[model samples]
Target: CPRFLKVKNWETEVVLTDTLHLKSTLETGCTEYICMGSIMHPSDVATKDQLFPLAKEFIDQYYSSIKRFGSKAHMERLEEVNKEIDTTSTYQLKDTELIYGAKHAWRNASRCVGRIQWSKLQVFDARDCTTAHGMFNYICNHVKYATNKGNLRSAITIFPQRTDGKHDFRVWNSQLIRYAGYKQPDGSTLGDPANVQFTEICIQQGWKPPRGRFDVLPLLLQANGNDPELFQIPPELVLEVPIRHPKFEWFKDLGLKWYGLPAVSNMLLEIGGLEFSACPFSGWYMGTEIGVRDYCDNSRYNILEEVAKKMNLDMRKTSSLWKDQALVEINIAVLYSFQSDKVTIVDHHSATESFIKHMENEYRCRGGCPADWVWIVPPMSGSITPVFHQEMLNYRLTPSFEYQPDPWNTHVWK
Candidate 1:
């Protein structure tokens, strides 16, 4: 039998087998924040050994960018990294180095189709932030800067980096502005269904739940030893666009909406053997993200059936092509609504065209562009997009952004 680990803190339970940690929760659901595991745990926080490979990777990529191939400075940096590997500490990156590292991570993000602005990302240095409350403040600033009063821009706010033998800071929310999902007595969800677990955790942390279909969830922040805290984002700070079709007046009655910015706050930013667990980044949405997945996916809004019925399409027959028709109209409404609202959103056709141009440019500049074809193609019309036919080679690359486990209720073990 697996032994249960004793905890000095009663706020949570720790399982020694997988080193699973459980936090206090409401009868609904809870978010557990794990602490103090060995280097063997993937999410235990990056150690010196992990940092060494990352540093070496960053050195190679960064040096190549500066046209300093095989130079003495590179050799000196490598030697320093070797010394740091065996020792108990590592060095902080310079401002210029940090900026380049952040930008390069975005460029190397395989799943992002919006890599055209990889080099232009505004890098905010929040590494000095020490507390969860402090991290929340910096995130607020990042949201304001990235929102840009409706004219959104690509930006990343990087928090503290992992140090030797220390737990790293982490942001628990998948995105900066996401709707909360309150489970009903009938098991039907109220807000964004994807965030049901997180919503319960927020409620447990003393957040007053807004029992609505589109209530925005509060930001969940956690620094090294601190129990994760919740902060409500101000209404004025968030920019939401109401969805309305250009030609169909009935569309407005559905009462659909989405936020202007798609700021991902939870993924790990790995560069040069260092991991910034609290780096939240944002980019304007591509229309298909909202239209196809958010609206069409059954687990989400699931509006296709309603839309098809409203359009008087024959749902009984597969030959009716109702799903395809509804998808096209929904996508049209998304692009139309964003454009009508003067918010930044790209259509799949245009976004894919831009991606092709980006590939050609990267080919001439860097010889090879790394990409994941599954993510590169648009969700609605894969065969129509330029990326569908193109053969893409995906490989491991340093200075990359990667998806990490939900810090709440999960532990990573090697």
Candidate 2:
């Protein structure tokens, strides 16, 4: 063990702090997994030699942000880190270090449509938690806080970093809050088709499968190397929007609804070289994300044709542009519903506008900002938004969110 590295391993550091465990509040019988985000390159492993350089750059940025760049305190802190890494091959982050790092991780999130909200994120440190039960506790808190009774906020709960590649903590769900998708015998889907595989996994793991369009899936958490366990999320903790349009009164009757929080749970957060495998983060949604993509995507709900028929549009001809017409009203419904519920959400028009401004700010401050043109532009509008015209330079930056192999891929099911 390195003296200066704060070398506390998860097993040795299992001083489980007292937290409110809602597991007891859930049901005994039935209880109990972002949009797809970037993968880790196999070469992205860290060592004593590798970690320090990344840590050095990470620490350097922190000090600079607090206006302490190159000061005596900054230099001494660097020396301390150098000594720490010199002893152990790794080191730890102070709470403030972790908080700042998480913020930048979102800012450095290349696919985020709303990176403008990067500065106001609430970072919760859950490094001491070593139990899957405790992981659920922290998740519920993050959900409650970010949901904010319909007035949403951006937030993340940082779980234990990977001690090595094998003994890792993970959230099996792609998004913290999502609807279950059931496979139909005739070849249709019942809910969010994106979650079909995970929903099936949850069922096999003793989840009492409920046949409903909007049934919220159970939380599957794995702490260290343990097989993922299912825990039912309390309905009270989730803020869901029952989507209805301002003008289309029939929209609510269609049984369309979605959860308020868009928290992604699977992404790996790499700050310098410390990999947080289960740091779940969330922000409010942009309306088109639901209205255009989530609801209308052919593979998702595939509700566009039904919605267009309601408007009596000419679905018979491409010349009618009925799909395009329906897209607007669908987007309007989402924005209107969320606003009526006082749940924070942005429309595509404003979301793209703000992103363009964010792009400009980044180029000015950092000389460049990494962006994925496919993601930055809203799914509904290709050329209408300003971001469609703005060119971007895509690249990776440290303190970034990355995709990791699904826990199921490596899990040996019991």
Candidate 3:
């Protein structure tokens, strides 16, 4: 192996090694390919015995990253962690530990393709956050800062860790900035059907649904065992790109649009064994996420047929190839819209190539890089990209983002 002094994810990173995470969502229409720990190994975070080893291992990694392993400072910090655990059963991560841990979790995300910039994620520490409204405010700041008026930066604002299994803080939204889905009388959805269940949850939580096609759902936040509170994300804090193609002027008439920040809030961030149940992480969208999955997925917006019809493509048969053409054009429109509006986004080819490069870099550092062939492949093109022909071994690693039961499902306080 070549002598590289520092380990970094300067190269691209990968996602989706296990098909279960992909298949679970496929069968259930849950959120996108989120690789969860529920179906994998379970590490209990409730006890100090379970917690200390992870802390020791985590501190070891932290010190080693700075080339300070076994230094007095490193050993002292380990003692401090042990002392805190002895005193409180569980301990808080130092602000620096939290920052590095968050970045490390992204590096080990194993399900996201955007970790090439894993070192670049901005961390907002809100472990001091004690109020639902305060959580709302911190979240707003996180969104506003990351949105950057469409210049988009990657970031995550971590709320308090679960003090206990019974009193965890949480965000109910799957993604922080998603459009609402309204159920129509004819049994069709008017907006994003992916959010219908969440939107209905929001309404039951006392939010009045705006029936518009792209209405942003209000934030549903639960703080430390309190009843989940409703807070409206100020409109100005939200940045959206109105969808339009560069050459096709009529495409704007469809009124298609998408939010700038995709902050995922539901997943639990596990560093060692400490469970942070409500950390909202944001990265700018890849073209296919908005173009293929959100817009083309039958359960989501499903705009392919509308686009095919608008382009006068034959709708009669599979051999017509209208869906293929529509998919490309919609993706082009998504890419062009974000670029034309001066927003940051990566096209599928660039993202995939970068992921392959990330794999190379990962293997250079570690023995294996876990990846899933199904989720990592571009939704539209299966064969053209370099990754389509490659084989991957999907496996789970620690300091990762894992799935937790949705707050709504577990809420019995009513």
Candidate 4:
């Protein structure tokens, strides 16, 4: 039996203050898992180290239109405090763990920022707690090491819940919904469900399965159109027309392409996405939901985060391009809910060498197959295939029912 899912390690420090309630709700399988955090300091602008730069960059580029701060005072205050943190806080410190960890986490969590919680100052007037909170979140979220995308800045909810103001959380906006789910139909509990229902959305947003038809009639038709084997009672079928009839050509062509595809000209290739600097202590991204988990779990992730802070390392080097979530390098383990042994390129589209080269520079791809790995032009066919093992057609065929290619004898089985 195949299950549509598997358990993944959701390691992070963002404590669900109500873990028991969370577990109980999960048992019902009705409500979804949501992760939220708190910001207790308004002037503490260092939202972890890696993410602070990109966050500032985004604010700098789109502050007027985006209104990230919601008010001019808020914006100015954030800039001012973050500036102070820059000169004095651990961001510029010479510890490898702190520097790299923050850098790694920020690549994915470029949206987070620090907010003040002046109420907590009765015991400690300093913003040490806020700084600790930022550091904790970054370290716990696998910003210390390369983890799975499923763990990427999973979800965040800020406390001191605002009812009148709508500018606090990213999820409060409809546009960020696109990036919220496993797939974009937006029905899953893990993602925003307001866009479309689950069933309809799955059909619309997820990859469509390839259609399949079996063909064992070729040998019988070729051997003897009128033979008893062709019309055996058990089989109850036979071809009275010529074996070389146009219809049989369909199977013949399918067979030919299968065996010949591998021998054709290879596809052009290029480098992949940018290389993310890893956290010196841990290997994940910092300031992410996962980081929160690690931080709350006895400061295990802080080891890497602290080193990153100390080293003063930068994840993605400075760039003038519009500030966007920077790509980080990690060996992500992606698994289909369904089980299959083979891995293959289901579909392919071409990208020019020049264009790919530019992308390599922009996205900071070090080097690989610049245009070919996933974008193979001659590597595979255009139309979708069934499970690779069950497939017969190659990449060059046009996708039309009437124009289906004829099968070849050599490719009938192999």
- Cα error, residue 280 of model 4, in Å, equals 13
Ranking by lDDT: 3, 2, 1, 4
**lDDT per residue as tens, model 3, 216-279:** 9999899887889999999999888999998888999989999878889999998856899999
The Cα error of candidate 1 at residue 233, in Å, is: 0.8
Instruction: Report the error of model 2 at residue 305, Å.
Output: 1.1
Residues 1-414 of candidate 1: C-alpha lDDT, one tens digit per residue: 222322121222211111121211111121246422222233345566756766776777677778886999878877876786668556567687889989877876656789988988899999888888898899888899888888888899998886632456788899999998888899887877888888898888798986898898899888763567788888899999999999889998989999999999988887676778889999999999999998899998889999999989999997989999999999899989989888889998888878877765765575546666767888878887777766554434557677676787552321
Where does candidate 1 have its weakest 10-residue lDDT segment?
21-30
Candidate 4 global TM-score: 0.18
TM-scores, each model vs. reference: 0.85, 0.87, 0.88, 0.18
lDDT of each: 0.77, 0.81, 0.82, 0.21
Local distance difference test, candidate 1: 0.77
Per-residue lDDT value at 334 in model 1: 90
- Give RMSD to native, each candidate: 13.1, 13.1, 6.4, 29.8
lDDT of 2 by residue, 90-166 (tens): 78888889998999888877688799889999999999988899999999999989998998989999998987666
Clashes of 3: 5
As for TM-score, the candidate ahead, 1 or 3, is 3
The positional error of residue 138 in candidate 4, measured at the CA in angstroms, is: 10
TM-score of model number 2: 0.87
